Amino acid sequence: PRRRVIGQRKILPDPKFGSELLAKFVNILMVDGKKSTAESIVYSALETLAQRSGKSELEAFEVALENVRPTVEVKSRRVGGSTYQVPVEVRPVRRNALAMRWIVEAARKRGDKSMALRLANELSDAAENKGTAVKKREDVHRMAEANKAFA
Amino acid sequence: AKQSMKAREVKRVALADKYFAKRAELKAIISDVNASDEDRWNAVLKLQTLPRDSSPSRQRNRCRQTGRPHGFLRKFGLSRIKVREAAMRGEIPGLKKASW
Amino acid sequence: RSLKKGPFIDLHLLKKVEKAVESGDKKPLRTWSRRSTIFPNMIGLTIAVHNGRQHVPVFVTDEMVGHKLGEFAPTRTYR
Amino acid sequence: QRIRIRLKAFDHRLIDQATAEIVETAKRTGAQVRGPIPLPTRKERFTVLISPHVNKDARDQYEIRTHLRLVDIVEPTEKTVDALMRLDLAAGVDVQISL
Amino acid sequence: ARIAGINIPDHKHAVIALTSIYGVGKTRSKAILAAAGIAEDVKISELSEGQIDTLRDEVAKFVVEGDLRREISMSIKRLMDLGCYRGLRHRRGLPVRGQRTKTNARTRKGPRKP
Amino acid sequence: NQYYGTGRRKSSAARVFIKPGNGKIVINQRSLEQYFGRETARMVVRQPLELVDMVEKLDLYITVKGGGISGQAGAIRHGITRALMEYDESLRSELRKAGFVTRDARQVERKKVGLRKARRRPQFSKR
RNA sequence: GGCCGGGAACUCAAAGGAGACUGCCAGUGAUAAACUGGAGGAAGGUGGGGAUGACGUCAAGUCAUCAUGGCCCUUACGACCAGGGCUACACACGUGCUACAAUGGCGCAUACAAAGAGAAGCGACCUCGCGAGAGCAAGCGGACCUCAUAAAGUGCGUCGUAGUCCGGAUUGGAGUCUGCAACUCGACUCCAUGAAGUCGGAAUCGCUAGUAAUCGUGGAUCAGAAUGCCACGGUGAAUACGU
Structure with a gap:
């Protein structure tokens, strides 16, 4: 907006593990006004991931997110009837949001049986540092590196 | 509307009032489950023999002041335009502009 | 249409068909009543039925019983 | 032997005047009465088109209230x-008595 | 299993496998299974010979194939020969049962620009 | 002697009665587990008591009417908050700082002429 | 079993009242108007939503709702009646509903609403029918009776990526109801058939909070005919660095 101020909206912690990050993750996974379905999917996937990795659910989730967070992006500008791709920094909140969205988008496009299995496999691959989300992060970094002369 | 189109409705209402009793039951025993084998054949025949304008489903609600056959409200007997005019002039008890 | 009510037919057509079949005649019977059902009694006559502009003649056969007279006088012209 | 009186109107000032008159007159003659209980109002709503020919998003909304x-x-x-x-009673008040 | 003139699948529950006959739906399937006396959560491949014979006898009470095909045939050609409104539409390729022709009617017309 | 509270949220109303001793809960002649089969719901009903150290020192008798699961849970929480304030009158600061004392007042917006919802508008064609 | 005696506390009903004013504390500012924070309070800076449309513009729309100058016909461009058409079909466009599935389809069992209508009307309980319905027949001009079961949800099975236990056009055969009369041209019911479609080229639209998205409920017009119009509640998000 032009002459406005945006305030933060209070978020409520998840029931079992009091994770605001996990409440946000459920929100982003959510679809069509149904929250219980998303909560069930998230909990099932996290449980299977913990069984597979032999660590806490929070720790596995955090490792996955750390392996996918970005740090520099590219923003468009118009100069002389042409387009420039100026590199810019990223804030922590935007880092978190981008990571979660990329993870969910990657998971939704696989070919397993159920969404819980899809998400578990995607999170495990991210933890091992290979997959579509990390591919996207690498591509973003490369496109930011190619344009360092326009800083 | 037209004067002839207004007269037609008077005719229809009069005939309905005239033949109501005859049409009511003396002819509508066709729905009877134990009337007879074909003592209702004559019932259907002599029902269709009656004038067509006597069936209540051949009447159309028209505005009492103008004659318009579209946009009718049963509570007031008028069309939307005349309802609005009378409401603004203040001649319909209890009615006003609403908001919530 | 519903049973326990019987078929439909108009009296001014029933009477004409009865008279013709009782006596012997072959001239066509004029009718504007496209809504009258066809009876077994009516086999072997010729009924000219209105369609808006003229009278179309139909010669009755055993296979036509139970239908409406209006299915054999179409009303719209195309090509 | 108990009497019940029901009052209806389009205006609450008028209804209050009539009901107060009823209660005071009744009490003036010895008998005892249980106060006037208020019952739910009714709202009838109508929506109309305000142009003569074609415009469909121009409308008026009216209501009638019954107390x-x-x-x-x-x-x-x-x-x-x-x-x-x-x-x-006044002109715009309707009263019903049941024995 | 080969119940009627055709074969039927041998890896799906009976109430569904029977549907492959041309003339048996989800109602007749359950009715036939109930009359025979077999559970409906059964794979056909677990049946015996006598059970299949009972199924054949049960299925042999409805018009199933060939006969009903011929029936619909004679119905349609009876209409066309009679030459009524429905027969005219049936020969001309347009929808019977009313419906609009100014737009749509593509099931009875075909792809655009015949 | 009992302590009373009244709660409202969306289109729901709740009556709450509090006594001391041996924590137990009944909502409409049923227990928490049977009534609310939603973990979020149970957590909302339990929040105000956990915020203080009286989880297992009071008995609760509650009735509720109108709305849905989330609305009824919010109403019950509000009622508990009012009852506790009446009973103690020294936890007001903590309850306010948590935010349980305010009456949430966002209802459903009405439908308007020419739109197809409160704010959704039909499709447009510049031609 | 609020079912009984009872009670007037609470929820609720509709009548009179109180409350919000930059009124108080600190800083900036021209001794100014105002601006940025805090306390208390259900609510804080026009708290949320509605009605309310300035002088004027487009020879903008409506002689067919009504009224009205001028012109025109009056054994006819004015009455009355039966049957047809406005529902046509090589083709082009705008607004919608239902999909192309597993955050799902089918079976069994069970939480939680708001707002409306009823006299030539709304119609319970009981019996018959697989079903739409039929026969007898209470109550109700109504916070009392009827319409009238909310659905998504929750628990247990089954289907295992197939044009399928996905989707439901189209067609044959039997019926029901309103109506003098359902061929052209009505709405529903049962049995059988089982189409295109696997997320849509260049274009292009709506939305800043209890909003978008999703699920059900009612009313006017009406003998009978909504997926459209006007209303009601349940679950309930993402993002705003900046010009």
């Missing part, structure tokens, strides 16, 4: 019923 009141008297005398049936 309702109840009074009941339990142990009357002979003269109270006479007075109550003799009474008179």
Whole structure:
């Protein structure tokens, strides 16, 4: 907006593990006004991931997110009837949001049986540092590196 | 509307009032489950023999002041335009502009 | 249409068909009543039925019983 | 032997005037009455098109309100019923008496 | 299993496998299974010979194939020969049962620009 | 002697009664587990008591009417908050700082002429 | 079993009242108007939503709702009646509903609403029918009776990526109801058939909070005919660095 101020909206912690990050993750996974379905999917996937990795659910989730967070992006500008791709920094909140969205988008496009299995496999691959989300992060970094002369 | 189109409705209402009793039951025993084998054949025949304008489903609600056959409200007997005019002039008890 | 009510037919057509079949005649019977059902009694006559502009003649056969007279006088012209 | 009176109107000031008159007149003649209980209002709503020909998003919305009141008297005398049936009310109030 | 003139699948529950006959739906399937006396959560491949014979006898009470095909045939050609409104539409390729022709009617017309 | 509270949220109303001793809960002649089969719901009903150290020192008798699961849970929480304030009158600061004392007042917006919802508008064609 | 005696506390009903004013504390500012924070309070800076449309513009729309100058016909461009058409079909466009599935389809069992209508009307309980319905027949001009079961949800099975236990056009055969009369041209019911479609080229639209998205409920017009119009509640998000 032009002459406005945006305030933060209070978020409520998840029931079992009091994770605001996990409440946000459920929100982003959510679809069509149904929250219980998303909560069930998230909990099932996290449980299977913990069984597979032999660590806490929070720790596995955090490792996955750390392996996918970005740090520099590219923003468009118009100069002389042409387009420039100026590199810019990223804030922590935007880092978190981008990571979660990329993870969910990657998971939704696989070919397993159920969404819980899809998400578990995607999170495990991210933890091992290979997959579509990390591919996207690498591509973003490369496109930011190619344009360092326009800083 | 037209004067002839207004007269037609008077005719229809009069005939309905005239033949109501005859049409009511003396002819509508066709729905009877134990009337007879074909003592209702004559019932259907002599029902269709009656004038067509006597069936209540051949009447159309028209505005009492103008004659318009579209946009009718049963509570007031008028069309939307005349309802609005009378409401603004203040001649319909209890009615006003609403908001919530 | 519903049973326990019987078929439909108009009296001014029933009477004409009865008279013709009782006596012997072959001239066509004029009718504007496209809504009258066809009876077994009516086999072997010729009924000219209105369609808006003229009278179309139909010669009755055993296979036509139970239908409406209006299915054999179409009303719209195309090509 | 108990009498019940129902009052209906389009205006609450008028209804209050009539009901107060009823209650005071009744109490003037010995018998006892349970106060006037207010009952739910009714709202009838209409929506109309305001142009003569074509415009469909131009509309007016109207409503009518009906106000309702109840009074009941339990142990009357002979003269109270006479007075109550003799009474008179304003133009826009409707009253019903049940024995 | 080969119940009627055709074969039927041998890896799906009976109430569904029977549907492959041309003339048996989800109602007749359950009715036939109930009359025979076999559970409906059964894979056909677990049946015996006598059970299949009972199924054949049960299925042999409805018009199933060939006969009903011929029936619909004679119905349609009876209409066309009679030459009524429905027969005219049936020969001309347009929808019977009313419906609009100014737009749509593509099931009875075909792809655009015949 | 009992302590009373009244709660409202969306289109729901709740009556709450509090006594001391041996924590137990009944909502409409049923227990928490049977009534609310949603973990979020149970957590909302339990929040105000956990915020203080009286989880297992009071008995609760509650009735509720109108709305849905989330609305009824919010109403019950509000009622508990009012009852506790009446009973103690020294936890007001903590309850306010948590935010349980305010009456949430966002209802459903009405439908308007020419739109197809409160704010959704039909499709447009510049031609 | 609020079912009984009872009670007038609480929820609720509709009548009179109180409350919000930059009124108080600190800083900036021209001794100014105002601006940025805090306390208390259900609510804080026009708290949320509605009605309310300035002088004027487009010879903008409506002689067919009504009224009205001028012109025109009056054994006819004015009455009355039966049957047809406005529902046509090589083709082009705008607004919608239902999909192309597993955050799902089918079976069994069970939480939680708001707002409306009823006299030539709304119609319970009981019996018959697989079903739409039929026969007897209470109550109700109504916070009392009827319409009238909310659905998504929750628990247990089954289907295992197939044009399928996905989707439901189209067609044959039997019926029901309103109506003098359902061929052209009505709405529903049962049995059988089982189409295109696997997320849509260049274009292009709506939305800043209890909003978008999703699920059900009612009313006017009406003998009978909504997926459209006007209303009601349940679950309930993402993002705003900046010009």
